[PDB]
PDB file of C-alpha atoms in Angstrom:
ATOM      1  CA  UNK T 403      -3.071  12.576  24.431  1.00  0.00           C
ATOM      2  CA  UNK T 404      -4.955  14.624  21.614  1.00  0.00           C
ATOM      3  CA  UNK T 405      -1.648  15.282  19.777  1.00  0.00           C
ATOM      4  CA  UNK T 406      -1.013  11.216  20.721  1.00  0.00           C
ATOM      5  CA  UNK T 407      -4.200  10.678  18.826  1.00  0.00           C
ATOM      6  CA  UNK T 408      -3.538  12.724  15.845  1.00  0.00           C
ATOM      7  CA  UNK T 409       0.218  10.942  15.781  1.00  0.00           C
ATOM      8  CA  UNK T 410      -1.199   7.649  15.443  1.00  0.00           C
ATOM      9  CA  UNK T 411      -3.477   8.618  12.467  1.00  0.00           C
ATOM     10  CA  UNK T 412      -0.862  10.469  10.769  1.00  0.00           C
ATOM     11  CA  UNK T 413       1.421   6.938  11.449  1.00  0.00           C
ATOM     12  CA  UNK T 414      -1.584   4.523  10.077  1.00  0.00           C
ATOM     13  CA  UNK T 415      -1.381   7.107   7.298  1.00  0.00           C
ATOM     14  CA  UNK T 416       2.143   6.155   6.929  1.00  0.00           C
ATOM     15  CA  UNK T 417       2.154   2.669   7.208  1.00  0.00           C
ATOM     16  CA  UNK T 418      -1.143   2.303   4.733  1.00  0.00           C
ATOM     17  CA  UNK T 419       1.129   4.603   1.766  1.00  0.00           C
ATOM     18  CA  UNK T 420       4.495   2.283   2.942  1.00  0.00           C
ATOM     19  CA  UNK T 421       2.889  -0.705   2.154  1.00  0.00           C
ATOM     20  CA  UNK T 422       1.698   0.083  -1.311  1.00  0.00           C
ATOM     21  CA  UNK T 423       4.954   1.060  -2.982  1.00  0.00           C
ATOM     22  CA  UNK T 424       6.516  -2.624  -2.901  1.00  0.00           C
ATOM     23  CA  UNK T 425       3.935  -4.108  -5.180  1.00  0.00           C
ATOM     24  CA  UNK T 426       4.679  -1.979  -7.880  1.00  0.00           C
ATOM     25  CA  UNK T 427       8.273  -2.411  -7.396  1.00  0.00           C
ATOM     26  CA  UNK T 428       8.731  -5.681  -7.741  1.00  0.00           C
ATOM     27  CA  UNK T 429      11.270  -7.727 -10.085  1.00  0.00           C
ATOM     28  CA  UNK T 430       9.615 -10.278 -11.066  1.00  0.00           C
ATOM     29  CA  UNK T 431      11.051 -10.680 -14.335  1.00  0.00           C
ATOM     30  CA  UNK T 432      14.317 -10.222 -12.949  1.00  0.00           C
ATOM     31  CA  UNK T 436      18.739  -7.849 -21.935  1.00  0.00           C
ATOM     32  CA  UNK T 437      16.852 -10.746 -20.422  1.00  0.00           C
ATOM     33  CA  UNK T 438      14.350 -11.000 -23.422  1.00  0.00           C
ATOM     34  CA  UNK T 439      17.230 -11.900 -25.844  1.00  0.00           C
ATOM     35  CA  UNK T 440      18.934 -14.306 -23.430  1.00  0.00           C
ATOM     36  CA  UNK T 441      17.609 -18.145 -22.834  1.00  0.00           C
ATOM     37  CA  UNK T 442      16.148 -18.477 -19.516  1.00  0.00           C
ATOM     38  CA  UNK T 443      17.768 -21.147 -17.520  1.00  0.00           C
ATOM     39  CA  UNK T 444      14.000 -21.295 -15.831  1.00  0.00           C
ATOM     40  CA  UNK T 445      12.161 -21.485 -18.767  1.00  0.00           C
ATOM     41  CA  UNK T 446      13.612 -25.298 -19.387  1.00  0.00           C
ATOM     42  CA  UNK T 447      11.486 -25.652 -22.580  1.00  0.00           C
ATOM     43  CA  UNK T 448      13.724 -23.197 -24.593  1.00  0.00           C
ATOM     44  CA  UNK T 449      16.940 -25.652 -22.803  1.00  0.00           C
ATOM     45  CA  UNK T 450      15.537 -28.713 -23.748  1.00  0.00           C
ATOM     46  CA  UNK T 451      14.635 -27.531 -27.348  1.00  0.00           C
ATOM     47  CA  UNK T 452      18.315 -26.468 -27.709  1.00  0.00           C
ATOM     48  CA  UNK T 453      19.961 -29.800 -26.458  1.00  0.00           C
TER      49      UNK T 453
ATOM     50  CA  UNK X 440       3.065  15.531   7.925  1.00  0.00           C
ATOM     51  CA  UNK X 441       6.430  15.503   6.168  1.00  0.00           C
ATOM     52  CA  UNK X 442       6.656  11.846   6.385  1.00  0.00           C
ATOM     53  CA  UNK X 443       2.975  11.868   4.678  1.00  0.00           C
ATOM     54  CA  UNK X 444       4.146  14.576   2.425  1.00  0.00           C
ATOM     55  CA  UNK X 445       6.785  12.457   1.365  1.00  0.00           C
ATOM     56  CA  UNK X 446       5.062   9.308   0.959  1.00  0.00           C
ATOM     57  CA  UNK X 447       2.395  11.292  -1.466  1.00  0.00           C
ATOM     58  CA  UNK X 448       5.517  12.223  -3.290  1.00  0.00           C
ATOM     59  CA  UNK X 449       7.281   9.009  -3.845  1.00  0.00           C
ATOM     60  CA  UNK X 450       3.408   7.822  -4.754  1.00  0.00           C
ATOM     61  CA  UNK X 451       3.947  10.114  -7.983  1.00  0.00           C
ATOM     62  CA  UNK X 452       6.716   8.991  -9.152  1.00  0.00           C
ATOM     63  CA  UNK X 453       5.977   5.507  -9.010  1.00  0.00           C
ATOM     64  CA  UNK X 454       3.006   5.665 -11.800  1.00  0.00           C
ATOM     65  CA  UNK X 455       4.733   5.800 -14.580  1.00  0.00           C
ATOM     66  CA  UNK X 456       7.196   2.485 -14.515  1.00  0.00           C
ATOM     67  CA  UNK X 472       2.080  -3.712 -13.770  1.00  0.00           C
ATOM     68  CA  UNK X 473       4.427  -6.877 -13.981  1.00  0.00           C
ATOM     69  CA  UNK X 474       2.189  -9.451 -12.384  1.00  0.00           C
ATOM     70  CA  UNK X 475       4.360 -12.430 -10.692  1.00  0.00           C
ATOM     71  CA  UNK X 476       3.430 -15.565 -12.742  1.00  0.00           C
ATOM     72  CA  UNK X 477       4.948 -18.687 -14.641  1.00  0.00           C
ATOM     73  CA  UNK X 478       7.078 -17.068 -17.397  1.00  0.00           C
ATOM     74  CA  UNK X 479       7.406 -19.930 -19.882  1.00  0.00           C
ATOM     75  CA  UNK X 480       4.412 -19.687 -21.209  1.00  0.00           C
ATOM     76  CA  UNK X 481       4.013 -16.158 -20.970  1.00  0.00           C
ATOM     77  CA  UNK X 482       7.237 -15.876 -22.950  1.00  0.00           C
ATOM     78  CA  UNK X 483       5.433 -17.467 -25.693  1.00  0.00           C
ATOM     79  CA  UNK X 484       3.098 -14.709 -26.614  1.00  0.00           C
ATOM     80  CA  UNK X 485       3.543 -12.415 -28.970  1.00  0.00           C
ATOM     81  CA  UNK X 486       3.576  -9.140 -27.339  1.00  0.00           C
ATOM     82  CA  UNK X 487       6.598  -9.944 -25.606  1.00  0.00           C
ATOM     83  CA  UNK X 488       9.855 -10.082 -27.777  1.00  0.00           C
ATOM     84  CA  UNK X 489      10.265 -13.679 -26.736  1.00  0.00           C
ATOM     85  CA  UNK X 490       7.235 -14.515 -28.504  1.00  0.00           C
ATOM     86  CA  UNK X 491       8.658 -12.870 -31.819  1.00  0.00           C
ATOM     87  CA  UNK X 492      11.930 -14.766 -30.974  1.00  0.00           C
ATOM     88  CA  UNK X 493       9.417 -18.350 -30.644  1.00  0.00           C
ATOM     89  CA  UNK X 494       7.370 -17.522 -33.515  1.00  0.00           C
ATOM     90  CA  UNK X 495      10.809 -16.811 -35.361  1.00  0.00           C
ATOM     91  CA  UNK X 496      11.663 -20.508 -34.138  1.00  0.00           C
ATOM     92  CA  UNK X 497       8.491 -22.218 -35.675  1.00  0.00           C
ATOM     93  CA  UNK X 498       9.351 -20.332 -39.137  1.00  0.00           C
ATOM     94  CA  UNK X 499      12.530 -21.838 -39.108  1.00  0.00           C
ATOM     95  CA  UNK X 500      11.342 -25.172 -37.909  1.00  0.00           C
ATOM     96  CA  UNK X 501       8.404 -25.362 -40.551  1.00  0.00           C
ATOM     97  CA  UNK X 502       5.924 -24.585 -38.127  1.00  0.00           C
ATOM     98  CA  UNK X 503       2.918 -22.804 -39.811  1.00  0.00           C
ATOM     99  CA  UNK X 504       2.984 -18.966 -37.808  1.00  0.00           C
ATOM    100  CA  UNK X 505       0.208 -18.916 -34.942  1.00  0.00           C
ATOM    101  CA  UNK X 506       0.498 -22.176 -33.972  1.00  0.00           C
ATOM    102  CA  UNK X 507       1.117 -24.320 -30.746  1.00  0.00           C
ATOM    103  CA  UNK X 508       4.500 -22.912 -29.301  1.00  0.00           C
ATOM    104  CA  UNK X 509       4.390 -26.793 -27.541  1.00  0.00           C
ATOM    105  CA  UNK X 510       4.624 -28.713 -30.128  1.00  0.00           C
ATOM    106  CA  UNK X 511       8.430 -26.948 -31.582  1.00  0.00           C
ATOM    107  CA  UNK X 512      10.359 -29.617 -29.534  1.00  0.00           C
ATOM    108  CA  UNK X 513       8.308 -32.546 -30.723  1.00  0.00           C
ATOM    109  CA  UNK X 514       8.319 -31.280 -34.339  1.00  0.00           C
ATOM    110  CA  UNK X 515      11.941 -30.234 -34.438  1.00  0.00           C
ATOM    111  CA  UNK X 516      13.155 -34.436 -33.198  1.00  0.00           C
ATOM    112  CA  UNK X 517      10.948 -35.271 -35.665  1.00  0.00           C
ATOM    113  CA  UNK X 518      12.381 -33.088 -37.623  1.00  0.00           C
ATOM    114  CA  UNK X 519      15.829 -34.578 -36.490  1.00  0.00           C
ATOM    115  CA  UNK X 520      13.976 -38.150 -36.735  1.00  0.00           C
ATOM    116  CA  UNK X 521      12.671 -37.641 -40.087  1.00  0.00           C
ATOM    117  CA  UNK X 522      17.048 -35.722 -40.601  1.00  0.00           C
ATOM    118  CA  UNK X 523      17.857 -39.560 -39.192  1.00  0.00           C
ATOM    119  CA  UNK X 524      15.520 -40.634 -41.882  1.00  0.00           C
ATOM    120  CA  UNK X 525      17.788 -39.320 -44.774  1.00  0.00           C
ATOM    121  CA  UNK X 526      20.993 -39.423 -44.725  1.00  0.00           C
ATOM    122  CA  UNK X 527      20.965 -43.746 -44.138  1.00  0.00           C
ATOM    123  CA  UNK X 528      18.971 -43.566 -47.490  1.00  0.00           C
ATOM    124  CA  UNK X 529      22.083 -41.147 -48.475  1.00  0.00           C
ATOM    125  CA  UNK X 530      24.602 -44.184 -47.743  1.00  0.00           C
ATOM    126  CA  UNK X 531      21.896 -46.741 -49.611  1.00  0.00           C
ATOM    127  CA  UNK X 532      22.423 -44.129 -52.524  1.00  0.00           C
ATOM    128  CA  UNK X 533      26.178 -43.582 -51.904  1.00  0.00           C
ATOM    129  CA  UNK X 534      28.048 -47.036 -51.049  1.00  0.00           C
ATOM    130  CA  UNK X 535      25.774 -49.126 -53.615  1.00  0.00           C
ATOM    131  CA  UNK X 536      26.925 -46.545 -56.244  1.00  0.00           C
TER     132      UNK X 536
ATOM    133  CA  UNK E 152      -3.105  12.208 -13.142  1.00  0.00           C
ATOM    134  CA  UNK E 153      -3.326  15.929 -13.569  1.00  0.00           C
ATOM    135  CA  UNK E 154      -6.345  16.120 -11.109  1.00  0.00           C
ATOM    136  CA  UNK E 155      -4.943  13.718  -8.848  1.00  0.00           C
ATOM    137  CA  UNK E 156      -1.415  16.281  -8.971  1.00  0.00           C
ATOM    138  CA  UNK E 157      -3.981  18.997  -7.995  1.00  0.00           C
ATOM    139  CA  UNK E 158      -5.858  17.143  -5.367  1.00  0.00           C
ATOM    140  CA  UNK E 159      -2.289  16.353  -4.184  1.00  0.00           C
ATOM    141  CA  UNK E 160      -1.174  19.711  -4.178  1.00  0.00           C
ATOM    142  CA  UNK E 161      -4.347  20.642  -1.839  1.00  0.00           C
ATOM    143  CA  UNK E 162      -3.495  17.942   0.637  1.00  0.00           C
ATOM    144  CA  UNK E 163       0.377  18.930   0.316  1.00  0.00           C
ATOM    145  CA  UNK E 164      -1.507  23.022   1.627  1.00  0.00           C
ATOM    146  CA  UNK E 165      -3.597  21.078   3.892  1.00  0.00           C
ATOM    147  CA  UNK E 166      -0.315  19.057   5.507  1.00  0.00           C
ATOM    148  CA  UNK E 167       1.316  22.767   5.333  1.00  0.00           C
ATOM    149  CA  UNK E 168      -1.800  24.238   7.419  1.00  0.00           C
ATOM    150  CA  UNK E 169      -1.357  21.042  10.228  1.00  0.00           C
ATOM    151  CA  UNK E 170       2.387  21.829  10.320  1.00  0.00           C
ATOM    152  CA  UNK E 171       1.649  26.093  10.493  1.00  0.00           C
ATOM    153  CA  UNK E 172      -0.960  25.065  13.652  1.00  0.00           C
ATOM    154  CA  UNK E 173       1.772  22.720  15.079  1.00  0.00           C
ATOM    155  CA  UNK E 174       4.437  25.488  15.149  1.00  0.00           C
ATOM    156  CA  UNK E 175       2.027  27.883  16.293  1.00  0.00           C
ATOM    157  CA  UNK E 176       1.250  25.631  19.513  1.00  0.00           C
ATOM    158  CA  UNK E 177       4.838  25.243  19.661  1.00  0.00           C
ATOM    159  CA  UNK E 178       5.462  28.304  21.616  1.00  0.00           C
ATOM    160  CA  UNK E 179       2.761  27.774  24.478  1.00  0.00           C
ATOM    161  CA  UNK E 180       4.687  24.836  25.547  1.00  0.00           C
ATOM    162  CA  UNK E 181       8.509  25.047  24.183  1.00  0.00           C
ATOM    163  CA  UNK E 182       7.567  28.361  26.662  1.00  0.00           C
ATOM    164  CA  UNK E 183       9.555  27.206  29.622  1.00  0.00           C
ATOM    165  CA  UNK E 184      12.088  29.995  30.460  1.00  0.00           C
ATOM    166  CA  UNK E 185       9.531  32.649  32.277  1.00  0.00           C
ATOM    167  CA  UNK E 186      11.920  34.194  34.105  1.00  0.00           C
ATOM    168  CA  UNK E 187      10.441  37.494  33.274  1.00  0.00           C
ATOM    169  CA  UNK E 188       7.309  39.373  33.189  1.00  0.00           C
ATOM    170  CA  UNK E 189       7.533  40.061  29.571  1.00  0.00           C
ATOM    171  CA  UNK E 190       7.220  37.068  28.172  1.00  0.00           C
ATOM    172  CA  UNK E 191       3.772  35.757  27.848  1.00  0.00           C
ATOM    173  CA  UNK E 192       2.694  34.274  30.878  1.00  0.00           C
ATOM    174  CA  UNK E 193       1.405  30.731  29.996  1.00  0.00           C
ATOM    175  CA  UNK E 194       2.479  28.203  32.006  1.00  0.00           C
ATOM    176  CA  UNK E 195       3.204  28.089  35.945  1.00  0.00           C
ATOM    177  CA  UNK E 196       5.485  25.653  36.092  1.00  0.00           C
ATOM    178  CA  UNK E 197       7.567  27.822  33.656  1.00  0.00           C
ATOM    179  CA  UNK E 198       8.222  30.289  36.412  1.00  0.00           C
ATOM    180  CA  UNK E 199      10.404  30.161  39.527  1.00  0.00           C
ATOM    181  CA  UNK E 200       8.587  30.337  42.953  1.00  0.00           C
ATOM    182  CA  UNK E 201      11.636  31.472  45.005  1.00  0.00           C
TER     183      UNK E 201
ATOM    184  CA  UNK C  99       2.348 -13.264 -50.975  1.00  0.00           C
ATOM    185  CA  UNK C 100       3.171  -9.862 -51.164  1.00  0.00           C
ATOM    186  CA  UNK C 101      -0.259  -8.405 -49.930  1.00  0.00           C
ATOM    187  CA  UNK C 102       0.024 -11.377 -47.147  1.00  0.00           C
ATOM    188  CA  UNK C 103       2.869  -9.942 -46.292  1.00  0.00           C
ATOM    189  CA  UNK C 104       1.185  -6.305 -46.259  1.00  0.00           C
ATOM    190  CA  UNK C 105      -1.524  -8.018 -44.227  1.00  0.00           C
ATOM    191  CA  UNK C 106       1.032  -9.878 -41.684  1.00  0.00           C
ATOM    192  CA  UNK C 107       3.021  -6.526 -40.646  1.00  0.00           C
ATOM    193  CA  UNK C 108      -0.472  -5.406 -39.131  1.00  0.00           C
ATOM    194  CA  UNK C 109      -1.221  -8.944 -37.561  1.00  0.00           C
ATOM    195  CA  UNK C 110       1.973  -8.787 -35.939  1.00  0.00           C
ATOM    196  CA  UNK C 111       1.547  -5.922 -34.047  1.00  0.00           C
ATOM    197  CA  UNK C 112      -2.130  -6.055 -33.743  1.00  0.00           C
ATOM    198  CA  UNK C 113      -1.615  -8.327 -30.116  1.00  0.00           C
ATOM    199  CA  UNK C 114       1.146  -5.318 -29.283  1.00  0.00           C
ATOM    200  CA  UNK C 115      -1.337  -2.621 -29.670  1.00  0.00           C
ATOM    201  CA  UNK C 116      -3.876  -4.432 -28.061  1.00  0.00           C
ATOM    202  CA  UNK C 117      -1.391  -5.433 -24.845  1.00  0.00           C
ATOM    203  CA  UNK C 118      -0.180  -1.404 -24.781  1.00  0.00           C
ATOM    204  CA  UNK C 119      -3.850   0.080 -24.802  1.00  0.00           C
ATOM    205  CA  UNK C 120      -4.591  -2.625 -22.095  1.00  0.00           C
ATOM    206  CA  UNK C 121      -1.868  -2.107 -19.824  1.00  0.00           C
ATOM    207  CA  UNK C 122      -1.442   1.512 -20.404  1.00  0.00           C
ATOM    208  CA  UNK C 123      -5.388   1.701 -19.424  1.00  0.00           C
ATOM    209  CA  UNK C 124      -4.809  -0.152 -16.062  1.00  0.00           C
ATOM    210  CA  UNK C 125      -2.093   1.964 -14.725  1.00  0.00           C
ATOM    211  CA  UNK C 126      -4.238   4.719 -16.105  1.00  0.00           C
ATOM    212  CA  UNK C 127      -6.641   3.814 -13.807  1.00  0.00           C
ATOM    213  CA  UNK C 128      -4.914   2.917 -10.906  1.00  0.00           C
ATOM    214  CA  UNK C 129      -4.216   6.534 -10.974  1.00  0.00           C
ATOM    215  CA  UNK C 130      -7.926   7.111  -9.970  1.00  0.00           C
ATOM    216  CA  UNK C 131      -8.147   4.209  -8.012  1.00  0.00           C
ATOM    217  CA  UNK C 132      -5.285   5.847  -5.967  1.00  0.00           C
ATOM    218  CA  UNK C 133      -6.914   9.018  -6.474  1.00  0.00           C
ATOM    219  CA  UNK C 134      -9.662   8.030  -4.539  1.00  0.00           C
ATOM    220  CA  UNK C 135      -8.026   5.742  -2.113  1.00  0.00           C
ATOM    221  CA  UNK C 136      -6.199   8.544  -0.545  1.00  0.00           C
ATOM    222  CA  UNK C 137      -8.750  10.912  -1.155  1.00  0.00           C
ATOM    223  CA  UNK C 138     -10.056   8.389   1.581  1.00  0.00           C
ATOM    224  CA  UNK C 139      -7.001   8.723   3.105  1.00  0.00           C
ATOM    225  CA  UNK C 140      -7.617  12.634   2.829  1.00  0.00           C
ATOM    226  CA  UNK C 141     -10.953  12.518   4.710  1.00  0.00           C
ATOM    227  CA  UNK C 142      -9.667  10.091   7.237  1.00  0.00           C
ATOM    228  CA  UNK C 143      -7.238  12.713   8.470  1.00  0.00           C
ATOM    229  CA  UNK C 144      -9.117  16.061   7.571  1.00  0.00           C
ATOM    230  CA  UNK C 145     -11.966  15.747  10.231  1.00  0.00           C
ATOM    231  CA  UNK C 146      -9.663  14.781  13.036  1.00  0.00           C
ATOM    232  CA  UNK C 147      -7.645  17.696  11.396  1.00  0.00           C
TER     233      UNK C 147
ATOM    234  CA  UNK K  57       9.088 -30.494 -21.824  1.00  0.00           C
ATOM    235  CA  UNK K  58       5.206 -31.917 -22.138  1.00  0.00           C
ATOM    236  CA  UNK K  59       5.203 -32.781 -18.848  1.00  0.00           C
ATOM    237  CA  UNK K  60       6.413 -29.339 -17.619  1.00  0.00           C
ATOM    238  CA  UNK K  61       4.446 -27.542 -20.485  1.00  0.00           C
ATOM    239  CA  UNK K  62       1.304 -29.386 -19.027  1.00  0.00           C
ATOM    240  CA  UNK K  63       1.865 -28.523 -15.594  1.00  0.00           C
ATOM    241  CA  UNK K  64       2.556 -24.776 -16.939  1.00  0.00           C
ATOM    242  CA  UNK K  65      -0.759 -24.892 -18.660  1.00  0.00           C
ATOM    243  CA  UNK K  66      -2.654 -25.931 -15.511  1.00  0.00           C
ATOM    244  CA  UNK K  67      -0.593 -23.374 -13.565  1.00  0.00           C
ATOM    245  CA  UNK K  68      -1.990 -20.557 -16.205  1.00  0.00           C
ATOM    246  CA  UNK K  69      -5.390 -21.921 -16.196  1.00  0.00           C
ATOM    247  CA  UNK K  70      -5.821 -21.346 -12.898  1.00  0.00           C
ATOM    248  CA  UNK K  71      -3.813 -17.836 -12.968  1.00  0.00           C
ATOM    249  CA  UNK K  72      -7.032 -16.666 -16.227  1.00  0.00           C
ATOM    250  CA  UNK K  73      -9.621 -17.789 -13.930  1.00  0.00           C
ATOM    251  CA  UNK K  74      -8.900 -16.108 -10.786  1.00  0.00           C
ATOM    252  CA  UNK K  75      -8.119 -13.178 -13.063  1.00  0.00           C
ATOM    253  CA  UNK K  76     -11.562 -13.448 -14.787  1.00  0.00           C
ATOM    254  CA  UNK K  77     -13.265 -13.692 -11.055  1.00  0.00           C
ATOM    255  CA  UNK K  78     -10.969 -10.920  -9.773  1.00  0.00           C
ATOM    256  CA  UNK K  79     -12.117  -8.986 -12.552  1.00  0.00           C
ATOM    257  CA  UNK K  80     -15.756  -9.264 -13.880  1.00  0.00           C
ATOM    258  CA  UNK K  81     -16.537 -12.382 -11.649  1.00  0.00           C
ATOM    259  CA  UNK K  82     -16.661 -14.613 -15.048  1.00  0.00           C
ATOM    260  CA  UNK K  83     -16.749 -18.878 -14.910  1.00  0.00           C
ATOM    261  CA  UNK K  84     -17.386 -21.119 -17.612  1.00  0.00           C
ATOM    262  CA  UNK K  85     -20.593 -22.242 -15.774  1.00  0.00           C
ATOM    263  CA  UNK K  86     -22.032 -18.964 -15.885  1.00  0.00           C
ATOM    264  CA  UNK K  87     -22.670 -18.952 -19.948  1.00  0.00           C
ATOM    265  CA  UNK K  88     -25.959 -20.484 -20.904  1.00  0.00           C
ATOM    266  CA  UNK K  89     -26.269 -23.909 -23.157  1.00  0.00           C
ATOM    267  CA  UNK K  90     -25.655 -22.228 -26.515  1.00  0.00           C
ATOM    268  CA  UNK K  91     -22.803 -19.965 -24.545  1.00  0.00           C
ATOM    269  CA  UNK K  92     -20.860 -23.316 -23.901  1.00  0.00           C
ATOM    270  CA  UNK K  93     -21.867 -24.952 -27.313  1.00  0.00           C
ATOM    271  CA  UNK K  94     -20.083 -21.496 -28.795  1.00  0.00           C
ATOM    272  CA  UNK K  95     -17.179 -21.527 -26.252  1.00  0.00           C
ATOM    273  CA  UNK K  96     -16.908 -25.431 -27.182  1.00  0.00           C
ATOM    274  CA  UNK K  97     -17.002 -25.007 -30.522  1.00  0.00           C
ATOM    275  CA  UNK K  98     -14.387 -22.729 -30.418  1.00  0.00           C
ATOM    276  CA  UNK K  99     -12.527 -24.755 -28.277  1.00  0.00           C
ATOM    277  CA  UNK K 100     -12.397 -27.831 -30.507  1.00  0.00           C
ATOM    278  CA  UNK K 101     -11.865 -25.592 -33.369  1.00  0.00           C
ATOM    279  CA  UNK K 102      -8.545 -24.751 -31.841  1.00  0.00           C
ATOM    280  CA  UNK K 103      -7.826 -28.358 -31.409  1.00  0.00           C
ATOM    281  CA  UNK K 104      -8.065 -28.849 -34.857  1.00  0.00           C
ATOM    282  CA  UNK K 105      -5.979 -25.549 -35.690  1.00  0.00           C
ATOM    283  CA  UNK K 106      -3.296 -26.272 -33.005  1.00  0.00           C
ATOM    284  CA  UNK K 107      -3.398 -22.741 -32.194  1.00  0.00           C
ATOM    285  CA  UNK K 108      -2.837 -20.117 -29.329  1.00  0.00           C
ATOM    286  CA  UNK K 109      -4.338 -16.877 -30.583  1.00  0.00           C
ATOM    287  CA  UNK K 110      -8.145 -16.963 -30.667  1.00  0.00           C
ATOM    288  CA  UNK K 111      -8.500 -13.599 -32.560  1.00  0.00           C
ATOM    289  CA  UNK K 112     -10.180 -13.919 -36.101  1.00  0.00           C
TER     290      UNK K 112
END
C-alpha cells in the first residue's frame, strides 16, 4: 500500500505532464500562406 | 520515474515550436502574417490607399468593375458614332 | 530555459535516487529462493518448512 | 517619395517586430511558468519521496 | 462577404475581450469619462480613416 501510494502520485504526475503537450501541438492553421483558403470565403468571393 | 523522466523530456523539446485556435479570415488580414502583405499587396493594386479597411477590397474592386462597366459603353458612344 | 534545464537535471538525479531506493528494496522481496542459510534471511515464507 | 519609401520599409516591418518580441516573450515565459508549475510538481512528489 | 466579415468581426471582438480579461482583467467600462472620450475619439477617428492599424 505505501509503494500503491507513491504509484498513484507518480501516475497523477503523469497524467498532469500528458495533458499539457496537446495544446501546444495543435494544427490549427492546418505553403498554406501563399495558397487561397477555401475557408476564408472573402479572398473566394473577391476572386469570382 | 522513467515515465516522469520522459515526460520532463518531451516537455523540453516542445518549447521551442503559441498558435491560438481562432477565426482566420480576419487574422489573415494583418500584417505580420504574409497574408496580410499578400492583402495589402491587393489594395495597392486595387487603388486602395495602404493601411486601410481590408473589408472594403470587394466593394471597391465591383465598383471598380462598376465604374470598368462605366467605360467602355462610353467607348462604343465614342467608337460607333465615329 | 537554462535554469529550468538545471532544475530539470536535479529532478532527473532526484527520479535517479527514487529508482536507486526502488532497486535497493528490490532484493528484500524479489528474495524468494531461501533455500539456503547463506542467503540473507528476510522473509519466512521464502523458506521451506519440510 | 523616395524618403516615403525609406520611411515605409520600417513601417512595414515595424507590426513584425512588434508580433516577434511579443510572441517570442510569451513562450519565453511559459518557460518559467512551466518552470514553476513542475517545480510544484517537484515538491508534490519530493516530500512523499 | 459583409455579412460574413461582420459576423467575423463580432467573432474577434469577443476573442480581444476575453483576451484583455484573461490577461490584465481590462473592459471598456473600466476607463474613466475622459478614458472613453479618448478611446471614442479614437474610435471615430478610425471611422473617418477607414483603417485597421491604430499605431501613430
Amino acid at each position: 500500500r505505501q509503494l500503491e501510494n507513491l504509484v498513484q502520485e507518480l501516475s497523477q504526475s503523469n497524467m498532469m505532464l500528458y495533458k499539457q503537450l496537446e495544446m501546444l501541438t495543435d494544427p490549427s492553421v492546418s505553403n498554406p500562406r501563399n495558397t487561397i483558403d477555401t475557408k476564408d470565403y472573402s479572398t473566394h468571393r473577391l476572386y469570382q | 520515474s522513467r515515465e516522469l523522466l520522459r515526460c520532463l523530456e518531451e516537455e523540453v523539446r516542445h518549447l521551442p515550436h503559441p498558435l491560438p485556435t481562432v477565426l482566420p479570415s480576419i487574422h489573415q488580414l494583418h500584417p505580420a502574417s504574409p497574408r496580410g502583405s499578400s492583402f495589402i499587396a491587393l489594395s495597392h493594386k486595387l487603388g486602395l490607399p495602404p493601411g486601410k479597411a481590408s473589408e472594403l477590397l470587394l466593394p471597391a474592386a465591383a465598383s471598380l468593375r462598376q465604374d470598368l462597366l462605366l467605360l467602355q459603353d462610353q467607348r462604343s458612344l465614342w467608337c460607333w458614332d465615329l | 530555459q537554462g535554469i529550468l534545464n538545471a532544475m530539470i537535471t536535479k529532478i532527473s538525479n532526484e527520479l535517479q535516487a527514487l529508482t536507486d531506493e526502488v532497486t535497493q528494496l528490490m532484493m528484500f522481496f524479489r528474495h524468494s529462493n531461501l533455500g539456503q542459510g547463506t542467503n540473507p534471511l528476510v522473509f519466512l515464507s521464502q523458506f521451506s518448512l519440510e | 517619395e523616395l524618403m516615403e519609401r525609406d520611411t515605409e520599409a520600417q513601417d512595414t516591418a515595424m507590426e513584425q517586430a512588434r508580433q516577434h518580441t511579443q510572441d517570442t516573450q510569451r513562450r519565453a515565459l511559459l518557460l518559467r511558468a512551466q518552470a514553476g508549475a513542475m517545480r510544484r510538481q517537484q515538491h508534490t512528489l519530493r516530500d512523499p519521496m | 462577404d459583409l455579412k460574413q466579415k461582420a459576423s467575423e468581426y463580432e467573432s474577434e471582438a469577443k476573442y480581444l475581450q476575453d483576451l484583455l480579461m484573461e490577461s490584465v482583467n481590462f473592459s471598456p467600462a473600466n476607463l474613466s469619462s475622459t478614458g472613453s472620450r479618448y478611446l471614442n475619439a479614437l474610435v471615430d477617428s478610425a471611422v473617418a480613416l477607414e483603417t485597421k492599424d491604430t499605431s501613430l
